[PDB]
Amino acid sequence: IVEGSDAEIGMSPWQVMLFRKSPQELLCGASLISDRWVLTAAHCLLYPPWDKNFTENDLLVRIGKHSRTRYERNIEKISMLEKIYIHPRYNWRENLDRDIALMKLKKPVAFSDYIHPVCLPDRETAASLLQAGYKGRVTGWGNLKETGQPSVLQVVNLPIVERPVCKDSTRIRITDNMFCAGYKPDEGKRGDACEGDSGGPFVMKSPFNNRWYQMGIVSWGEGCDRDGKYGFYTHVFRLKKWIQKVIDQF
C-alpha cells in the first residue's frame, strides 16, 4: 500500500496473509469469508506469464496478523489449504477478467478479537454502495512504493471511479467484472495498492446496517500510485453466483 497508514489493532480482522513456504515470503493478500473459506485473486495462485503456479502444499494462510514479518504467537493463526478453486473463466491471457479464487482450509479457524469474517454483498448492497465517489478501504502488507516494505498492515481509503475514466486510463480492455478506484491527479490526495497487496480486500461499511462488505479484490494496476492511473478490482458481487456454487458444492 502506497501512501496509506498503519492499521489499527483489529481494524481488519478478515485480513489474510498468503505466505509462501519456500522461500518464506509474502505471496499475496486474501480475506476470510467464513471459518473455512478464504477469498483471493486468481493471479496470486496462477499466472503463467510470470511462471506462477502454486499448489495447496506451497503455501500457508496466516490470519489475525498485524506485523508483516513476526510470528504473532497467541494472536495469529496459521492454516493449511485443503483445496484451491480458481474461476474457470479467469482470463489471465488478456486482462485478468474474473481475477478470483477460493481456498478451503483443512480445519475451521477459531474467531477472536483479531480474526472475524467479512460479509459478501448481495445485489442491493452492490447497487447501493458501488457508486462513483463512494469510498472503500484497501489493506495489505505489500510494497510502500513502486520502485520499501511495511513493518505492519497498511490501510488506505480510496474512491470508486466513473467507468469511462477507468477505461480512458489504460489500453487494457476493462470488463463489467472490474471496477477501478483511486484519486484523480487534481484531487490532491494519493494512495494505491502495490506488489504483495493483490488478493486483498476492498471493503465498504454499509451505512444501512453498519457491517463491512467486501466489494472488491485487489487485482491489478499499471505501476503503483501513478498519476492518471487507477487500481482495478474484481467486482465481488458480479462473481457471487460462482462463489455460492463452489461453497455449496464443496
Binding site: 489493532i9 483489529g10 480482522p13 460479509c119 462488505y213
Partner: peptide, 27 residues
Amino acid sequence: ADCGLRPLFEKKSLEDKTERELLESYI
C-alpha cells in the same frame, strides 16, 4: 449472521480513525 462486525470496533461501539471518511462519501 455476525459477518462484518469487528470485535474491537462495531461490537463495542468504537469507531476506527478513518471510517467516517467512508461514511461522508456515501452521499
